């Protein structure tokens, strides 16, 4: 688009970062992340630890799971596996449970810091409606 609808200065900083990455890098990962950052909140549904673990169950382990949303803890999930989760915002319970399980909680700026092209990444979205 032309301008982010959000009023968060840090979200606009992320928008500038991913505009630069999309323009100077051929990464479809960067392009889709930029579009999802431009997206509104209801178009960015929250993801759950149960969902990300169910997607992580297979050989996709040791891949950095990437979701542009709020990662919410799920009481139904009893055991949380080790994982590296990078998201816009983490709820306190979700972050605490990930850290207790031994995973790594990351921000999107450090995501671009480590792997600008989204190598070894696993993109997830939330449930629609």
């Amino acid at each position: 688009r032309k301008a982010p609808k959000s009023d968060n200065v840090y979200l606009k900083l992320l928008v500038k970062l991913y505009r630069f990455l999309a323009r100077r890098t051929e990464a479809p990962f960067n392009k889709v992340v930029l579009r999802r950052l431009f997206m509104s909140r209801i178009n960015r549904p929250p993801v759950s630890l149960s969902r990300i673990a169910r997607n992580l169950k297979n050989g996709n382990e040791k891949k950095t799971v990437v979701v542009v949303a709020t990662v919410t803890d799920d009481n139904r999930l009893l055991q949380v596996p080790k994982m590296e989760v990078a998201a816009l915002r983490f709820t306190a319970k979700a972050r605490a449970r990930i850290e207790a399980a031994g995973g790594r909680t990351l921000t999107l700026d450090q995501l671009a810091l480590e792997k600008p092209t989204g190598a070894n990444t696993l993109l997830l979205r939330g449930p629609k409606n």
Binding site: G102, R104, E114, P116, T117, A119, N120
Partner: protein
């Protein structure tokens, strides 16, 4: 435990106070028995204090002098604690790499270059002590050129917890960019010395294995360029 009240004045905002704290740490490092008893936790606190001292250092020439002194402390520490000193330094650097803005980032990169060169010129005496070479190469294999993503600090028991520290791609790229310059400055790029040839061949095998095993395209490309530097014996 150890009583080390000078780290606070090391982090203090006055240059005279920081210099006095650095001289006190000089005396501390000279004290051999305490230096012999330096643990990993202790070296982690000292290197955190020095990290913040450099962070507070303002001007270019004072920064260069402070980095030189920080590199030169290694000859002051004893043999049984040099390995702990370097390991704590690189743990501190991996923990605080991402938090530095660019303006202090230049001087922290200069500090990293200086300490790497200091380790390489402490490798000296076969004209090169194999034990020192082994220690330095083990350090380079664990923190810089790691086949894994994280480093394990302390051991697991009822008397201790856990430190898992991830290695930054930025520090990896810097070491891949400065190891050639530092080996040239220290004098391992002389083709006459068979010991030097074996050491540089081992370093080349290390960075090559990193090239084939790494999963970061930036690391792959920069390792390829470092190997393609024309000053190496292979490409000459």
């Amino acid at each position: 435990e150890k009583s080390m009240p000078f780290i606070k004045h090391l982090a203090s905002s006055d240059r005279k106070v920081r210099t006095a704290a650095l001289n006190s740490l000089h005396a501390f490092l000279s004290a051999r028995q305490v230096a012999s008893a330096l643990t990993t936790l202790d070296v982690l606190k000292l290197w955190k204090g020095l990290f913040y001292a450099l962070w507070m250092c303002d001007r270019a020439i004072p920064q260069q002098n402070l980095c030189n002194e920080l590199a030169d402390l290694i000859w002051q520490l004893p043999r049984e604690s040099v390995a702990t000193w370097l390991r704590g330094f690189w743990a501190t650097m991996a923990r605080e790499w991402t938090g530095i803005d660019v303006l202090r980032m230049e001087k922290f990169l200069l500090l990293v270059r200086r300490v790497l060169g200091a380790s390489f010129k402490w490798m000296k005496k076969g004209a090169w002590d194999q034990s020192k070479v082994d220690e330095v190469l083990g350090l380079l294999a664990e923190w810089p050129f790691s086949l894994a993503e994280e480093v394990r600090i302390t051991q697991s028991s009822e008397k201790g917890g856990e430190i898992v520290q991830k290695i930054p791609v930025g520090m990896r790229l810097h070491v891949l960019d400065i190891w050639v310059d530092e080996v040239e400055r220290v004098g391992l790029l002389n083709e006459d010395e068979e010991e030097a040839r074996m050491i540089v061949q081992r370093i080349s095998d290390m960075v090559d294995a990193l090239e084939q095993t790494t999963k970061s395209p930036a690391v792959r490309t920069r390792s390829k360029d470092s190997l393609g530097d024309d000053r190496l014996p292979a490409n000459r």
